[PDB]
């Protein structure tokens, strides 16, 4: 069970994230039995999984097409501009249940949130070759202590 749960938690999160996909859109209404069905197209008739007999390369495999119906369901149903948006989420998603990379909630906090950093007037000096909202944003991305050098 702890061998095959990261495969649970990637399916509710994507399945949530459908959910909540409402709100970008009204046209964006997934239900519950949508996502059963990508998990039962995933988990059954995979041509991949056809001569795989290995429990973890089973596991993977079923992982990434999981991830690749999703997207090509939800996407196909979807505008051109949010493909990216959800290709962006999905990605986001794999990140949080991969294990041996750092959870970088940092530099997404700064991704995301990063506009809601207070510049004082004065404390953004004009730097050579950038313009005014370049060097401003320098300035906010400089705050991370991976790029205060920057």
Same mark, same amino acid.
């Given at each position: 069970?702890?061998?095959? $749960?990261?495969?649970?938690?990637? %399916?509710?999160?994507?399945?949530?994230?459908? *959910?909540?996909? /409402?709100?970008?859109?009204?046209?964006?209404?997934?239900? $519950?039995?949508?996502?059963?069905?990508?998990?039962? !197209?995933?988990?059954?008739?995979?041509?991949?999984? /056809? &001569?795989?007999?290995?429990?973890?390369?089973?596991?993977?495999?079923?992982?990434?097409?999981?991830?690749?119906?999703?997207?090509?369901?939800?996407?196909?149903?979807?505008?051109?501009?949010?493909?990216?948006?959800?290709?962006?989420?999905?990605?986001?998603? /794999?990140?949080?249940?991969?294990?041996? *990379?750092?959870?970088?909630?940092?530099?997404?906090?700064?991704?995301? #949130? &990063? !506009? *809601?950093?207070?510049?004082?007037?004065?404390?953004?000096? #004009?730097?050579?070759?950038?313009?005014? *909202?370049?060097?401003?944003?320098?300035? #906010? $991305?400089? %705050?991370?202590?991976?790029? /205060?050098? $920057?």
């Amino acid at each position: 069970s702890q061998q095959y $749960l990261p495969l649970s938690t990637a %399916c509710s999160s994507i399945y949530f994230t459908m *959910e909540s996909l /409402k709100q970008i859109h009204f046209l964006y209404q997934y239900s $519950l039995q949508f996502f059963l069905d990508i998990y039962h !197209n995933v988990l059954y008739e995979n041509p991949n999984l /056809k &001569g795989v007999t290995d429990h973890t390369q089973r596991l993977s495999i079923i992982t990434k097409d999981l991830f690749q119906v999703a997207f090509n369901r939800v996407a196909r149903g979807m505008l051109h501009q949010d493909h990216i948006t959800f290709a962006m989420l999905l990605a986001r998603i /794999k990140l949080k249940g991969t294990v041996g *990379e750092p959870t970088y909630d940092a530099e997404f906090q700064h991704f995301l #949130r &990063g !506009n *809601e950093i207070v510049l004082s007037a004065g404390s953004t000096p #004009r730097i050579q070759g950038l313009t005014v *909202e370049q060097a401003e944003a320098v300035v #906010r $991305l400089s %705050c991370l202590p991976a790029f /205060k050098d $920057l």
